[PDB]
Ligand binder design. Structure first.
Ligand SMILES: Nc1ncnc2c1ncn2[C@@H]1O[C@H](COP(=O)(O)OP(=O)(O)O)[C@@H](OP(=O)(O)O)[C@H]1O
Ligand SMILES: Nc1ncnc2c1ncn2[C@@H]1O[C@H](COP(=O)(O)OP(=O)(O)O)[C@@H](OP(=O)(O)O)[C@H]1O
Ligand SMILES: Nc1ncnc2c1ncn2[C@@H]1O[C@H](COP(=O)(O)OP(=O)(O)O)[C@@H](OP(=O)(O)O)[C@H]1O
Lengths: 151, 157, 152
């Protein structure tokens, strides 16, 4: 419910093109609560486990190499239906189909340079959060606006 | 008729709810209507009485959320507004996004700024008939200001 | 290559009058499209009649030409993968009544006849429009510093 969490990663192209603050602002202004935030170079072992559902796809090795080629911003956000709603805010996975107003619709063009990843399901979010963050890196606090965001 | 000056003079009632005020979204919301080309006619900051809210939401008096909605709308100040323009009722609703924020698209006010249906930041008239009733209920005629936008000939044919 | 497709975008006199030039350009730059041509001009009625030749028999044609000649326009050429189709998506529906929030027309204008901008509808129309509005020498070629982060 209101405490659902999702994993969002800003990809190396999102960092290189100076979109970190823009992306974070979209989640903050929506009313989602920041739980975790890290900046790192993800190892190929970590990326292969993150993208384990894609291990049989032809683009898998290139996606892992690319995701390891620069730093990423790993994040955890909390809120009601944050997994599904986070995916709507990102826009379609393929930027060609993403609508203006979405992060990919506004800021990127091609699927291998799509700036961001968001968990596709509550099950995938729980696995991704556990893989990228130690439990002690996730911060719990109450937003001063909680009563104005949720009944 | 299409292209008539009178069609450009349609008005709608928009209220920024207590959560929109609390979360500092008043300026953001007003900027969206101004940049679109809609003309501001009325604007006031007020605490709406429960009697005014019960009449505003009279069609919902039998819904289970009615009492909570009236209490919530009375719990803080609201920004009441009247905007004018071609199809401003329907287009204002499109700009707000779906009533339930879960279904509102990015780019819309609710799509960008809020999450749950009971805390949806804003109300807009659902039809020209509801707009006429709502404008009359929230504003005295002397609070509605008429003027001509300097960009009128660049917004309308 | 497919990443070198080009489209023609014109900001109409109402877009210039209402101070939307920078906002429109920012939308194309932030998307990752490359600016190729940019010129500010009063389009002649002869140029506009050729640009809108397919509408010469429509009842609104004379008013459209007069309107497009009534003030300056910003003529532009942008480059990128599927920039024609994607540029149209970014502009929003031709009729602003049907354009969604988040698009240029959805955010900034209301009526057809004052719809702030034009974008090529097809690669064939883009080639014709670019040739009509720009001399080849006005089109600038350079490589974006972010090319490898926009395209694989
Ligand atoms: N050709 C490709 N090159 C690189 N990554 C790709 C390619 N096709 C798909 N993907 C990635 O493969 C993942 C799955 O995308 P799909 O389109 O197959 O499914 P999805 O729309 O349900 O996410 C996406 O990763 P992301 O969530 O980190 O964006 C997508 O970007
Ligand atoms: N659970 C709820 N709690 C509070 N208000 C609600 C709830 N469900 C619906 N409403 C409100 O009830 C009003 C009518 O919304 P509906 O979606 O029911 O519309 P409808 O009656 O045509 O279906 C909306 O008010 P607004 O225009 O000021 O936003 C909507 O927000
Ligand atoms: N009543 C009208 N007055 C002025 N221009 C019009 C009118 N109806 C259509 N047009 C213009 O006629 C052109 C063709 O619009 P259509 O709706 O017929 O087709 P489109 O949606 O497939 O592009 C558009 O020009 P633009 O690309 O420069 O915007 C459109 O604006």
């Amino acid at each position: 419910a209101n405490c659902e969490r999702t994993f969002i990663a800003i990809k190396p192209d999102g960092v290189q093109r100076g979109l970190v603050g823009e992306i974070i602002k979209r989640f903050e202004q929506k009313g989602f609560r920041l739980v975790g935030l890290k900046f790192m170079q993800a190892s190929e072992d970590l990326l292969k486990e993150h993208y384990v559902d894609l291990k049989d796809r032809p683009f898998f090795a290139g996606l892992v190499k690319y995701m390891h080629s620069g730093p990423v911003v790993a994040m955890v956000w909390e809120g009601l239906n944050v997994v599904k709603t986070g995916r709507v805010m990102l826009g379609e996975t393929n930027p060609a189909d993403s609508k203006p107003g979405t992060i990919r619709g506004d800021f990127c063009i091609q699927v291998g340079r799509n700036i961001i990843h968001g968990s596709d399901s509550v099950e995938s979010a729980e696995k991704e959060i556990g893989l990228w963050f130690h439990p002690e890196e996730l911060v719990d606090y109450t937003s001063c606006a909680q009563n104005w965001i949720y009944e």
